[PDB]
Design a binder for this molecule. Structure first.
Ligand code: CA
Length: 223
């Protein structure tokens, strides 16, 4: 997250870190046994780390649970990033508490202008590299479809939305991928892609979660 703030320990209780020897992507806990992330975060050997603040220090609220099954969206296209969503099932159910909690799925899509909370352990610099140990947060509005398409001609599908600031300076960045965009208490987005980070006229692009609620629910119901 570039241009954000330190969230505070365990203040984003649905935020997970995906770990394969190190943090490599975010995700969102959607029930005791399932995490939503980005399909482009897929790999084998995932351990889901819940209850994290500093990802390099055991601080006492963590739960580390291996993935038992990954399910990349049936229509994910890694070239265009259309349908950039996957589900991860945990080998055991997380123990839910005030610091480890699921985030509601949306029953309705969100509109341009709605404020949202974007979070992660990604790079905090738009030129150069500095990775935080503690969770970072950014409040950002959803941008209109028309301004998203004007920023990224030929690249925005109906499964994507932009959020952030056209003036630059505030955005998600490398290492935030797969993490949450929460608006009014609902998971509306997944950190997906953008051209660089925090550049003028290049806002972040996010997977439009409301389009996937039916798939998420029926996948969970049979897996
Ligand atoms: Ca920790």
């Amino acid at each position: 997250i570039v241009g954000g703030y330190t969230c505070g320990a365990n203040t984003v209780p649905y935020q997970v870190s995906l770990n394969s020897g190190y943090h490599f992507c975010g995700g969102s806990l959607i029930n005791s046994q399932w995490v939503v992330s980005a399909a482009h975060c897929y790999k084998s050997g995932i351990q889901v780390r819940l209850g994290e603040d500093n990802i390099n220090v055991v601080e006492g609220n963590e739960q580390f649970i291996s993935a038992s099954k990954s399910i990349v969206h049936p229509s994910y296209n890694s070239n265009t990033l259309n349908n950039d969503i996957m589900l991860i099932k945990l080998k055991s159910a997380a123990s839910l508490n005030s610091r480890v909690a699921s985030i509601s799925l949306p029953t309705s899509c969100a509109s341009a202008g709605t404020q949202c909370l974007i979070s992660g352990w990604g790079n905090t610099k738009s030129s150069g590299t500095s990775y935080p140990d503690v969770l970072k947060c950014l409040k950002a509005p959803i941008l209109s479809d028309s301004s998203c398409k004007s920023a990224y001609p030929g690249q925005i599908t109906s499964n994507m939305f932009c959020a952030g600031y056209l003036e630059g300076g505030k955005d998600s960045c490398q290492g935030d991928s797969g993490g949450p965009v929460v608006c009014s208490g609902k998971l509306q987005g997944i950190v997906s892609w953008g051209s660089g980070c925090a550049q003028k006229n290049k806002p972040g692009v996010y997977t439009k979660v409301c389009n996937y609620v039916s798939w998420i629910k029926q996948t969970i119901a049979s897996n």
